[PDB]
Amino acid sequence: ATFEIVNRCSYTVWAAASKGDAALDAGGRQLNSGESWTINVEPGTNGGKIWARTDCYFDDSGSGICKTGDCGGLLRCKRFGRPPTTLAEFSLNQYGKDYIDISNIKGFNVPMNFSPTTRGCRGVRCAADIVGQCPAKLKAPGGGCNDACTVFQTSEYCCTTGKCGPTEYSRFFKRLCPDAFSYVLDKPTTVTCPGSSNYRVTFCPTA
Numbered sequence: 001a002t003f004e005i006v007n008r009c010s011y012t013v014w015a016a017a018s019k020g021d022a023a024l025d026a027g028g029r030q031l032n033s034g035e036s037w038t039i040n041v042e043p044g045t046n047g048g049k050i051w052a053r054t055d056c057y058f059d060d061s062g063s064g065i066c067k068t069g070d071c072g073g074l075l076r077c078k079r080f081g082r083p084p085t086t087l088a089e090f091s092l093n094q095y096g097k098d099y100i101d102i103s104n105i106k107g108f109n110v111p112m113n114f115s116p117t118t119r120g121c122r123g124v125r126c127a128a129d130i131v132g133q134c135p136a137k138l139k140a141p142g143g144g145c146n147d148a149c150t151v152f153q154t155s156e157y158c159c160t161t162g163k164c165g166p167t168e169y170s171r172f173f174k175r176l177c178p179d180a181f182s183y184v185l186d187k188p189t190t191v192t193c194p195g196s197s198n199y200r201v202t203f204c205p206t207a
Helices: 150-152 169-175
Strands: 002-007 013-016 021-031 035-040 048-053 056-058 065-068 087-094 099-103 114-117 124-126 191-194 199-203
Touching: 002 013, 002 048, 002 169, 002 191, 021 035, 021 048, 048 065, 099 114
Parallel strands: 002 199
Antiparallel strands: 002 035, 013 021, 013 048, 048 087, 056 065, 087 099, 099 191, 114 124, 114 199
16 A cells, blocks of 8 residues: 655644554654655555654654654654554454544544545544644643543543543643544544545645
8 A cells, every 4th residue: 555644834843653562664754834745554454553753853864753652762663653643553454344533532633634645534634723723731842632541541531431421621632633642432433435445644634
């Protein structure tokens, strides 16, 4: 499958792509404002994610650090990144269909559109100014807007079974981005696409 990753933001981002135990394609790359990076994601990739990282620096070998979304200090990510990270999540060729979503469950850093470039399904977007509106307690010192479970580490915010529901801090994200997950038990906002679709992830998509 082809994934085009396009940075429309005014700032540089360091894109990342991983399935948790390995890189997808090169795993990560600097994207200047306006730059695009096209990757190949193997058919049958389950549990893949793409995200942006902000305020990074790397040496010539690809070792360094990012303020949001750092993946073990690497440019070429092999594992998932440190919150807060807006997440494009996908599982491909799963019993004939692909499944895509955007999630704020691990916070928000950069606005994103995640859309098919082939026929037969909708895209999703979370492009509100979540960082500017971030509630004071959720502001991340290094930039971005943390999810409540990361900040508070209580069952109310982190529960995955219960006795578990939305809160004002999960609703903060859901109100601004209805089409992205805000907590683990949200009514799903996953899109089912034809198997073997192609996609574009756009950072700071055009309104």
